[model samples]
Target: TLSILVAHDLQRVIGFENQLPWHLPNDLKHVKKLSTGHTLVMGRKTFESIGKPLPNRRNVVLTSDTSFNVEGVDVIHSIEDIYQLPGHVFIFGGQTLYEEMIDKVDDMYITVIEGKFRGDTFFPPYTFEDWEVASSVEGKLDEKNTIPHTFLHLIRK
Candidate 1:
């Protein structure tokens, strides 16, 4: 199965200066819960921003730069390569990769952060007209995570 895992603020801002604008530990935990043990596909900058390959999951980096390589990461030059990956695949972000893989995603795990944020990168323009909400969970707020958010699972209709 092909899925998309993303978090965006009110203005659809997914990133700011190549990193997440907010520090929401709960959301980070949520991402791990959903993506662990699955294959994670992301762009080069996104992979680099993460700094290292996450443990317990296969990491695939999608990049046009053929020479870009990282230990423990499988680099692919085209989107077509993702189709051949085994088990569940999660297309995580970096603007360009999300825009290219949105149409091919069968499930969407979205985290909607409340309020506006300052960001230079945004999630692609996608109206969920063809998707149905499979589940919705409200995020909890704490000292470590002050933001209000909701986790939504949408499946293709």
Candidate 2:
């Protein structure tokens, strides 16, 4: 409960697409469940992809442009606001936002996929010596999908 819960789908080039590659229901549930009474920090694009405000949870949108047409989301300019929360805060990202939050994350939950894709964005290396894999479950996209994916639970060593 050290104020961080970094979650992401390990799909390459996920940043360029306007939507999440995986099914929306499952992903939103993942967020809602993990962040029930906690807060979620994301980029504008990630927030928009969800299409609406998540009820009963605080949504903090990080942006540098300083202008956007979104309501019900708290626009934050720095990490200062993040530390105000004492519980497990979730950092849901696209690309730029993930890079900014990586070092400060105490635990990471990643959905690893089995494919190399072409895209314009990615998460930085998770080579933090403190990282340790704690749990995982394998999942197949579909009969012909072949896009096997697994949820990985990692924590600081």
Candidate 3:
């Protein structure tokens, strides 16, 4: 299975200063729950922003820089290499990666934040009309998850 796992604000802002602009622990937990035991594909900057490989998952970093390498993670220089990955593959984005892999993913797991935020990177505009919502769940506000957000599972129509 090929999929995209991401969180974005109303304006489609996903990152600011190479990091998530909001604090929502539930969203992080949602990411881990869905991506565990799957292959996570991300760009070099996204990998760096994360600092280390996430546990219980296969991390694949896409980079044009030949010298870039991380211990225990697979490195690929071309987008075509993604097509050859086996099993469940989730595209973890950093703007550029999402743009390239958007059309190829079979479904999407999106966390939609309630409001606009300050961000430098945005998820590429996608036609929601081409996708059907498989499931939608609203996150509750709590001590660690103060932000209002909704988890959406979208399948390609």
Candidate 4:
């Protein structure tokens, strides 16, 4: 079964310009460790924003419109195509893509940032009712983490 991983804000917003400002190594490092040597499926825009390959992970970009090309990244035309990949495959970002593949994901790692902010994007509310909390930890608010944040490890039921 494939799993998903993402770092997000309290408002559920994932990006402003297809990027996140804060550097939460624990979150990203977890993405690296969990998905190492595996695939990170993402929308076309999110894939393009990375600019470079995430260390120890294979990048898989999903898009309907084919234009941009990267030699190392495998660009697929649709979310339905992800079922073909092996091991735990994580979705990198963009709401529409996540909503499309949510049902297929066995696990979801969410870094729910605590604060209030307005944004153009948002993560769909996860009803923990059907999901099991496998693990979780809270990080104390720092200069950058003024909003506070908590990491959640959810497994599909």
Reference-based TM-score of each model: 0.96, 0.76, 0.97, 0.86
Q: Give the C-alpha lDDT of model 4.
A: 0.76
Taking the tens digit of each residue's C-alpha lDDT, what string does model 4 give over 46-128?
77777766767788888887786887888889666898888768887878888787777888888887765556667777787
Best by lDDT, which number? Answer: 3
Lowest lDDT block of 10, candidate 4? 21-30
Provide the clash count, candidate 1: 0
Give model 4's TM-score versus the native structure: 0.86
Candidate 2 lDDT, 1-157, residue by residue in tens = 5334433345444544665454434434555677787777888777877877688877888777678556777887776667776666788776777777777777877766555565566767766477887888775555544566666778878
How many residue pairs clash in each candidate at the backbone level? Answer: 0, 0, 0, 0
What is every candidate's alpha-carbon RMSD to the true fold?
1.0, 3.3, 0.8, 2.1
- Sort order, TM-score high to low: 3, 1, 4, 2
* Candidate 1 clashing pairs, residues 3+ apart or interchain: none
Predicted candidate 2: what Cα RMSD to the true structure?
3.3
TM-score winner among the candidates?
3
lDDT of 3 by residue, 20-90 (tens): 99999999899889989889999999999988999999999999999987887999999999989999999
Q: For candidate 2, what is the TM-score?
A: 0.76
